[PDB]
Design an enzyme around this catalytic site. Structure first.
Site, PDB file in Angstrom:
ATOM      1  N   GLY A 162       1.107  -1.342  -0.149  1.00  0.00           N
ATOM      2  CA  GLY A 162      -0.080   0.098  -0.023  1.00  0.00           C
ATOM      3  C   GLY A 162       0.901   1.467  -0.077  1.00  0.00           C
ATOM      4  O   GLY A 162       1.827   1.593   0.836  1.00  0.00           O
ATOM      5  N   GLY A 185       0.777   5.269   0.950  1.00  0.00           N
ATOM      6  CA  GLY A 185       0.163   6.854   1.508  1.00  0.00           C
ATOM      7  C   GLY A 185       1.031   8.673   0.863  1.00  0.00           C
ATOM      8  O   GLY A 185       2.341   7.760   0.148  1.00  0.00           O
ATOM      9  N   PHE A 229       3.079   9.761   2.770  1.00  0.00           N
ATOM     10  CA  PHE A 229       4.346  10.151   3.184  1.00  0.00           C
ATOM     11  C   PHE A 229       4.859   8.531   3.136  1.00  0.00           C
ATOM     12  O   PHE A 229       6.055   8.260   3.146  1.00  0.00           O
ATOM     13  CB  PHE A 229       4.103  10.934   4.830  1.00  0.00           C
ATOM     14  CG  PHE A 229       3.825  12.012   4.196  1.00  0.00           C
ATOM     15  CD1 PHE A 229       2.456  12.028   5.012  1.00  0.00           C
ATOM     16  CD2 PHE A 229       4.554  13.133   3.890  1.00  0.00           C
ATOM     17  CE1 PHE A 229       1.566  13.406   4.503  1.00  0.00           C
ATOM     18  CE2 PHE A 229       3.869  14.799   3.853  1.00  0.00           C
ATOM     19  CZ  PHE A 229       2.057  14.091   4.570  1.00  0.00           C
ATOM     20  N   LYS A 260       7.633  -0.555   6.467  1.00  0.00           N
ATOM     21  CA  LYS A 260       7.610   1.058   5.864  1.00  0.00           C
ATOM     22  C   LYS A 260       8.873   2.069   5.691  1.00  0.00           C
ATOM     23  O   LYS A 260       9.000   1.941   5.568  1.00  0.00           O
ATOM     24  CB  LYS A 260       6.304   1.239   6.896  1.00  0.00           C
ATOM     25  CG  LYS A 260       5.804   2.741   6.780  1.00  0.00           C
ATOM     26  CD  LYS A 260       5.192   3.236   7.853  1.00  0.00           C
ATOM     27  CE  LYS A 260       4.763   4.665   7.868  1.00  0.00           C
ATOM     28  NZ  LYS A 260       4.073   5.249   9.057  1.00  0.00           N
ATOM     29  N   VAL A 299       1.057  -8.401   8.735  1.00  0.00           N
ATOM     30  CA  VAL A 299      -0.396  -8.955   9.164  1.00  0.00           C
ATOM     31  C   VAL A 299      -1.257  -9.502   8.405  1.00  0.00           C
ATOM     32  O   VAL A 299      -0.711  -9.169   6.694  1.00  0.00           O
ATOM     33  CB  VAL A 299      -1.564  -7.317   9.691  1.00  0.00           C
ATOM     34  CG1 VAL A 299      -2.871  -7.871   9.131  1.00  0.00           C
ATOM     35  CG2 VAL A 299      -1.493  -7.550  11.255  1.00  0.00           C
ATOM     36  N   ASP A 348      -5.374   8.593  14.826  1.00  0.00           N
ATOM     37  CA  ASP A 348      -5.384   8.419  13.510  1.00  0.00           C
ATOM     38  C   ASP A 348      -5.811   7.284  13.362  1.00  0.00           C
ATOM     39  O   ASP A 348      -6.203   5.834  13.524  1.00  0.00           O
ATOM     40  CB  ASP A 348      -4.200   8.110  12.643  1.00  0.00           C
ATOM     41  CG  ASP A 348      -4.378   7.905  11.711  1.00  0.00           C
ATOM     42  OD1 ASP A 348      -5.667   8.434  10.852  1.00  0.00           O
ATOM     43  OD2 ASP A 348      -3.638   7.857  10.517  1.00  0.00           O
ATOM     44  N   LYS A 389      -8.863   4.738  12.462  1.00  0.00           N
ATOM     45  CA  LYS A 389      -9.760   4.413  12.134  1.00  0.00           C
ATOM     46  C   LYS A 389      -9.944   3.134  11.164  1.00  0.00           C
ATOM     47  O   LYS A 389      -8.788   2.758  11.124  1.00  0.00           O
ATOM     48  CB  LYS A 389     -10.181   5.158  10.680  1.00  0.00           C
ATOM     49  CG  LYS A 389      -8.302   5.522   9.793  1.00  0.00           C
ATOM     50  CD  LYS A 389      -8.268   6.727   8.726  1.00  0.00           C
ATOM     51  CE  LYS A 389      -6.774   6.543   8.236  1.00  0.00           C
ATOM     52  NZ  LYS A 389      -6.602   7.367   6.738  1.00  0.00           N
ATOM     53  N   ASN A 448      -7.140   1.499   9.308  1.00  0.00           N
ATOM     54  CA  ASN A 448      -5.984   1.187  10.468  1.00  0.00           C
ATOM     55  C   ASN A 448      -6.104  -0.226  11.686  1.00  0.00           C
ATOM     56  O   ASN A 448      -5.241  -0.225  12.533  1.00  0.00           O
ATOM     57  CB  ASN A 448      -5.087   2.085  11.030  1.00  0.00           C
ATOM     58  CG  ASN A 448      -4.560   3.252  10.239  1.00  0.00           C
ATOM     59  OD1 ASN A 448      -3.669   3.055   9.286  1.00  0.00           O
ATOM     60  ND2 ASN A 448      -5.131   4.381  10.716  1.00  0.00           N
ATOM     61  N   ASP A 502      -1.226   1.823  12.296  1.00  0.00           N
ATOM     62  CA  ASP A 502      -0.477   2.426  11.687  1.00  0.00           C
ATOM     63  C   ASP A 502      -0.111   3.814  13.010  1.00  0.00           C
ATOM     64  O   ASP A 502      -1.144   3.624  13.819  1.00  0.00           O
ATOM     65  CB  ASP A 502      -1.229   3.154  10.498  1.00  0.00           C
ATOM     66  CG  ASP A 502      -0.342   4.393  10.086  1.00  0.00           C
ATOM     67  OD1 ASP A 502      -0.648   5.324   9.563  1.00  0.00           O
ATOM     68  OD2 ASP A 502       0.582   4.617  10.445  1.00  0.00           O
TER      69      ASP A 502
END
Length: 273
Positions: free
Chosen positions: A17, A19, A21, A39, A93, A136, A138, A141, A158
């Site tokens: 995935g 993002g 940043f 990451k 995960v 954050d 949500k 996440n 995250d």
């Protein structure tokens, strides 16, 4: 951070995935053969630059991750840094998104869901105990360690906006997705642990109905709804929802942060018992 080359100890793979940043890729540690979620966070070059992440913000996210250790929170394995990026080797995960898992089953008893919401509450409870505001919280996440098990565990994956509440000076900006942020955030007001609780209120609402309580057709409409806390329990979705459930959500989605339930109150709440 380890100044050596990631590629020397890990074999990066498929991209998982992206993002604004970061970009997380699946990697395989050479000496163990274990899979991880690397990451990649691009560093900020100039203080005036609007691109990348400032090493201080990176510092903050790493310290938090290094401190936490709970079954319901992702764990950091290693941290590498090169000329351009700071790589965080994170726990990998496999269960996917929680809401994707639930949205594949038939009807989901209001109690069968509370078992999952209970997990979330714990992770947040842990974090809050260490005075860490996630900032954050949500759906995106919240994933599952493994989905092929009796009681699949959820993981808060995250920690980019995560902040350690320090006595004294405070922060004001640091806000994420409009659909899930709290009014304090929208109006750029003093932030605390309350924001996270508001987020939880939104998660549970969607969790039970399958509809967002403030999602507008555009970012501006949403923020407007959030700012006005104009949600409602339209009988078309909340007809099979207990009175306690709604109460639980009501006590969380309140404009005044001081009047908003805390992580402890939410666990003591009769809907959770």
């Amino acid at each position: 951070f380890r100044q050596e080359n990631v590629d020397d100890y890990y074999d990066t793979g498929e991209e998982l995935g992206s993002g604004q940043f970061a970009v997380v890729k699946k990697c395989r540690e050479k000496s163990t053969g274990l899979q991880y979620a690397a990451k990649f966070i691009k560093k900020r070059r100039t203080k005036s630059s609007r691109r990348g992440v400032s090493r201080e913000d990176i510092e903050r996210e790493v310290s938090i991750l290094k401190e936490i250790q709970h079954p319901n929170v992702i764990t950091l394995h290693e941290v590498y840094e090169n000329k351009t990026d700071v790589i965080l080797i994170l726990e990998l995960v496999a269960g996917g998104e929680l809401f994707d898992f639930l949205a594949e089953k038939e009807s989901l008893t209001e109690e069968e869901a509370t078992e999952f919401l209970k997990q979330i509450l714990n992770g947040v409870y842990y974090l809050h105990s260490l005075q860490i505001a996630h900032f954050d919280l949500k759906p995106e996440n919240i994933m599952l360690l493994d989905r092929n098990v009796p009681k699949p565990r959820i993981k808060i994956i995250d920690f980019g906006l995560a902040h350690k509440i320090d006595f004294g000076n405070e922060f004001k900006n640091i806000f994420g997705t409009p659909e899930f942020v709290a009014p304090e955030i929208v109006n750029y007001e003093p932030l605390g642990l309350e924001a996270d609780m508001w987020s939880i209120g939104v998660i549970t609402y969607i969790l039970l109905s399958g509809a967002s309580p403030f999602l507008g057709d555009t970012k501006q409409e949403t923020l407007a709804n959030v700012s006005a806390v104009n949600y409602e329990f339209e009988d078309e979705y909340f007809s099979n929802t207990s009175a306690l459930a709604k109460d639980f959500i009501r006590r969380l989605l309140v404009k005044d942060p001081k009047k908003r339930m805390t992580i402890q109150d939410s666990l003591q709440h009769p809907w959770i018992k």
